[PDB]
Amino acid sequence: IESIENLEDLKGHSVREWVSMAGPRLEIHHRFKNFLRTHVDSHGHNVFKERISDMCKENRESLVVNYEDLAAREHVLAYFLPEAPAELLQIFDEAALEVVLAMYPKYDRITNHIHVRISHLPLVEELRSLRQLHLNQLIRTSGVVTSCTGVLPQLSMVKYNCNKCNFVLGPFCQSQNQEVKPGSCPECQSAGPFEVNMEETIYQNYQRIRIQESPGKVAAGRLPRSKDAILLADLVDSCKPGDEIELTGIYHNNYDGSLNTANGFPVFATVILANHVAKKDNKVAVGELTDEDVKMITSLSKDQQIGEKIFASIAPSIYGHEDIKRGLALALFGGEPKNPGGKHKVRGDINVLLCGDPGTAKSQFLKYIEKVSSRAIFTTGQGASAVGLTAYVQRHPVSREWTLEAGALVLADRGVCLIDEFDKMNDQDRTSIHEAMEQQSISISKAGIVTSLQARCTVIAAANPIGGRYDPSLTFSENVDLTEPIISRFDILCVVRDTVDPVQDEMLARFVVGSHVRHHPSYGVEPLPQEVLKKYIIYAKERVHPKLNQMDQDKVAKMYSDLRKESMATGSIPITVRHIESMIRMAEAHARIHLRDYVIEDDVNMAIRVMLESFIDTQKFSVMRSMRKTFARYLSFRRDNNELLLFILKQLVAEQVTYQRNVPEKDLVDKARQINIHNLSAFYDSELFRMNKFSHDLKRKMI
């Protein structure tokens, strides 16, 4: 077969038969092999070497190709791909298998076929806009998955035992169109009750989903359109009911006598043969992270001011509210679940309650967390129910047996449940979340179903006080209207007030008007870009797991004991035992923010500060100052310790001068590791050595 120098001249054919014949088929095969081997990104890095290597590391049998890259590098393949998608995807699968077995010669033991998936295809279509013009073409659509079958085995290459003799009928390919009837046995011509040879038959995973238009893209009072889609092989369980997805697939039609007799006209059934599923929720998975991305994340973690940067990156368009940003950062990164002895589970997720005045950006904080977090569920007040929050039982739509279904807390199982207008809920709806908040489970005993579902989510709620205005004359317990069991289930408990303060009002006004200028259609520390923050968050949550070695038990124990005393004194907030475990969770969350594999006293002091400041915030005006001096003098607001390193430096300089008269930074840091004062960067940024005329340089190491 001679190489074909121009695929583009169809010479009167259509694309389907043109690429079906051998010459153009081999030319397409070689072009796709060369594309995979030689395509490089803007930095010159061979992207497909990395992608195939990751696929073979993880045994995933599927290779995502970016259509933008294909169109940029090899034009005619991008030209023919949407016109004859089945044929070219078959050729691409063959070529990808050749390249994969060139890279990893033993990968045939793991797979026998590589599925090339296409992403970022510009041929986006609305479900309501699909026409007969799109038939047998590669389309891209969006919608919410509303139904899913179980993963079912489907015949792909089926063999039949002959009904009389021992012969086996040849491989017949399943089509998605009709049942394959064997015909007659070529040995003996019998055509009786044939039966499938299960052992010699090749099966494939099958899953039929129904997607419909997303409820925010449909018009009000209008019914949504929907399509069936077939997921085959490793595309099964790419989505669940409720998932917003983008779906690339072949728009396929076949004759259906049922539709013909339903309509009275020869109407053909339609289905999408899915090629690529991408959840609009998970725009970036952990598998999508490249070596550049993880190198960026790990190098960025070494900044040593990263905690302030991460805190500042929480809702960068909101002035002030540094304590809110801190608490939301800790909740967003989260702690670690633990189960000592396999018999005592304790939650790792941190729950947050933002109570306070109108127009104080509580809802804006909640919508920011919704936007930034993967697996965010947002709900509001009366719009939620006990049943809808937790889980619900219904007659199955077609078969009519009772079936359990996932509520918001179950759907957010490794994510965030956001409850705006939390005080406006019904008590019966609000009490439903207790088990999910603490025990991280939802137990249902209804209509013959008796089971517990996992609801390991983090609850971030927003509320108003009684009368819609916080009263410093009263404590939090006196003006919230919530009760102790629900108040104690929130680890971080924030009060936001809108009191007059002219200088802060001027700065806030300038920030707000500057924001309106910046975002037109066209604290000090600087934040991360939000894309980088999302990548950092998912890496920190999935690839990093803090472990607590010690936390200086005496400090936290004494703190908890007298925090209990003052809570009993004022009645401002119940403290129970949950606040201790909140301390451990917040320490683990700060360690995760710093990407530490092990928790340290830096994290413990951060958690201590958060707890004490919020508890102080719950108090009245006069009581608040006395509480401030109480917990500040006696307990640990460990701001800095520069004096010890200062006189260690002075002592070392005095001894060195005395030695020389009659590498100092190495001497200093040696003493700083000998004594438990290891955070020396703070001393090097502080003024105490500077006005004493010392200085530092990481290269010269002289001071």
Added chain:
Amino acid sequence: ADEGQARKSQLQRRFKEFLRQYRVGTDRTGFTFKYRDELKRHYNLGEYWIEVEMEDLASFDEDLADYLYKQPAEHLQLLEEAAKEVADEVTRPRPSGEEVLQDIQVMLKSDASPSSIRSLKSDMMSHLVKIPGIIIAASAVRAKATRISIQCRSCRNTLTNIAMRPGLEGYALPRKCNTDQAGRPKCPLDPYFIMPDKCKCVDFQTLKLQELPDAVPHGEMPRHMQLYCDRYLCDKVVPGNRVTIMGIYSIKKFVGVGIRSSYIRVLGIQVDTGAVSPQEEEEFRRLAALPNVYEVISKSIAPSIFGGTDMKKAIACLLFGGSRKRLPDGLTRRGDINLLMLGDPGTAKSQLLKFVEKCSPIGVYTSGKGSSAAGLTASVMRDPSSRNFIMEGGAMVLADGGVVCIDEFDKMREDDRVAIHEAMEQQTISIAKAGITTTLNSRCSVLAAANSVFGRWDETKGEDNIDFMPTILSRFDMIFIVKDEHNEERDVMLAKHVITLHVSALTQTQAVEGEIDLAKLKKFIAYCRVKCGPRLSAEAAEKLKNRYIIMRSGARQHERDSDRRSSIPITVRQLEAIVRIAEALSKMKLQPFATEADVEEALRLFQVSTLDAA
């Protein structure tokens, strides 16, 4: 061709030599022919089954083990036929009435790590798989034909002892009459019919295996897998059991076009955990015999929880239970103990429920908010397979013989709460709905957790802290009102305990002195429950009588002094509750009689509940 039969003969011979030659032991100690001995003893007991270990088979001959893994259906019948041969030559001669050799069911187990239900993908069809899960449904046991004979309606031409393939696969009757000439009539289109008197049938059962709760991906519902059980695997498990299934992943063989329904043909069941080995048995005798068994049990209840010793002791009494009785006139007296924990938040009530559900031999946990009357007791519904009304058990039925842990007990609706009165006292559920009229058993303890009406107890409020009715409250043997006491040294010790508890999660889960592991205490509770039912001694009963009268007079005078009725009544059910607690304390020690010491301890525990009343 017959070369396939030659292959079958040699493979059956190799399985026979495995079962004839396999030994365990060492030359220093001695050898025992494991599978010969098991075959002999089971056949003489009339059991006609054995369980073979895949690792033993692989050590003997790895090719046979590989063949069983890859092609279990083909080679398991050869293994079973070899087992039948070995059974014959191991048991011959047999007495009269046992001359006819029986078929042997060969079950399989392995030490291999199991796969998940979601690991079962199309590459593994017809292969041998091992998966865990929970039995959530189990059908009635029914008959599956293993051998049939079919007779032709015209000529009475008969085919005899047709082998029926195991599993949910059926059989195709021949399309045209076999082996005789095409005469007149040639054939009516179904010439054959199954002869009624010649069929050989075996028991079979259908079960639903649910995915384990900790195996489910985040946000997804647990998956279901159908299980086909056969012969002695029928009724080996019930709903609520945790199992490791060994079986053949297969399609049924008599939404989409080429879609086939899959199931697992079970070849072995390992209940994860009706029998105690003698070593466990004598160790349980020892454990009951030692003098501080009550304290050891109480320290074993929820060891990660600081304090609450009286509550743990009452929970131990609830776990062991009293003794159920039927009196000469046919009336039944409840044996189970009902316990309510009521009060302040963050006091480990939910942790105690989560411990008891895991420690009890039979135990179910449910939230009061998430439950209903039908879902707790029993529900009535129509079946899509046959339009008739059937019953489905609720929490009480599923926990019959054990404990229902009702968390959030104050949150359930009152109309749903009145459903469990009969199941709490009479231990029965009388249903009369949709024509079906019956009375099911619900012999289970209720361990309930609840909060105050005002969250905390708020001690000035008194009786207004309780919205429960006297009817439901009188059905609880003990009502522990739990108050979170703010004491400084208590708080320091509790905080250090919690911090150490969180710190120690990485310590490789080492054994501990002076307490019973949960897996052992579960078995011990089951053993004591099935073995020992105590009674009161006479003098002990006299002590209980007099103390009860004193307590009743005190309760009456307290209510009279208050001029208001207390929410907790002191009734004859509370007398019988004290009796049940004393019997549970004796049952911990396996003593046939309850002593004055047991009655005194029961009264001590009950006087916490009487403190909670007065």
Added chain:
DNA sequence: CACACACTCTCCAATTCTCTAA
């Protein structure tokens, strides 16, 4: 199961082609 419809195949004989006489 069993009694009507729906469909194919085969054989039989009736019509038309070819060659001859009236």
Added chain:
DNA sequence: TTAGAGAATTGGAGAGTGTGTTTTTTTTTTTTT
């Protein structure tokens, strides 16, 4: 030039094969009570 006797082709009768069928109750959930 008509038409009639013998041979070959086409019409359709009928024998044979295969397919399809015979309001009710309990429970949930949201909204309205």
